[PDB]
Design a protein around this ligand. Structure first.
Ligand code: GQM
Ligand code: GQM
Lengths: 164, 164
């Protein structure tokens, strides 16, 4: 049992799907669990795909950088889609060390302890339209290190202040 | 010929060096070539290590996000260490698509077509002190895909405006 890695780019270079399509497809094909670590999450199309996964019964764990969490909240409000009322979705925040806000500068998407997308793509309009980025699609043994990291992050996460 | 990957964290988790020490060590041990793709580069200790590599005769190619390039220039000026007068160092900028500045959201360090550090760590004080991040140390076949990507980026880079 080794590790396999494909590179994807935005803009695309020698692969048929954009990074965003690949994300939406990875969410679409989730069977059991989605673990997401994201710095900024405002992309409505990716959000919808996640909500939909949850309604099929997939458990979804999301960890967001605390300092940008408001941009996610704003987006969920616009979508008339309160994350607290969705029973299969947990969302917690992670911060770094303050001095100036320390941040969780990590991002990745993990599905079913089977596939990871790891890279520089944030779930925002601007990464679809403006930014250059790259990700890895990872399968095999190294996905276990992404579980351990996700669990580790989750262990240090807080319930966002908005939730009473 | 496969690929090998180790994960490093900041803060450190089960490895002896911090990400910053590992960077400085990778630069220290460079023999021939350093290729760096960086979103923001203001860390004086990493800069010094690069200058020093260059004076030993290592060719250094740096690609920086255009929109943050001024922060690098400012730092080099403070250090009394003009990058244009250093014969072994080339620096070019890369931008994304504008609308709001599109950015090069990619970063990695490549040494000698042998080792890559790929991850969320930017070469700034704040990643040593405040931010949570992670990188991969990559060796083996996948390093060739980082050459191709670096060459591709380099092909799309511009001479910064400051250089006449
Ligand atoms: C906090 O604990 C968790 C929660 C979820 C996962 C996971 C795996 C694949 N998708 N989601 C995990 O690996 C650990
Ligand atoms: C723009 O062309 C280049 C320049 C430098 C490299 C390199 C390899 C290892 N370090 N630096 C490369 O792979 C392609």
């Amino acid at each position: 049992g080794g590790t396999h890695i494909d590179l994807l780019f935005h803009p695309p270079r020698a692969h048929l799907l954009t990074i965003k399509e690949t994300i939406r497809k990875m969410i679409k094909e989730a069977r059991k669990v989605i673990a997401l670590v994201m710095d900024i999450f405002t992309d409505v199309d990716i959000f919808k795909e996640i909500v939909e996964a949850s309604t099929r019964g997939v458990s979804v764990y999301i960890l967001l950088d605390e300092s940008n969490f408001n941009h996610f909240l704003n987006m969920t409000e616009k979508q008339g889609c309160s994350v607290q009322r969705l029973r299969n979705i947990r969302v917690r925040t992670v911060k770094g060390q303050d001095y100036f806000h320390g941040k969780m500068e990590q991002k990745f998407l993990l599905v079913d302890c089977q596939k990871v997308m790891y890279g520089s793509y944030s779930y925002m309009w601007s990464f679809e339209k403006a930014h250059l980025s790259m990700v890895q699609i990872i399968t095999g043994q190294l996905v276990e290190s992404f579980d351990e990291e996700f669990r580790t992050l989750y262990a240090r996460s807080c319930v966002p202040s908005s939730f009473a």
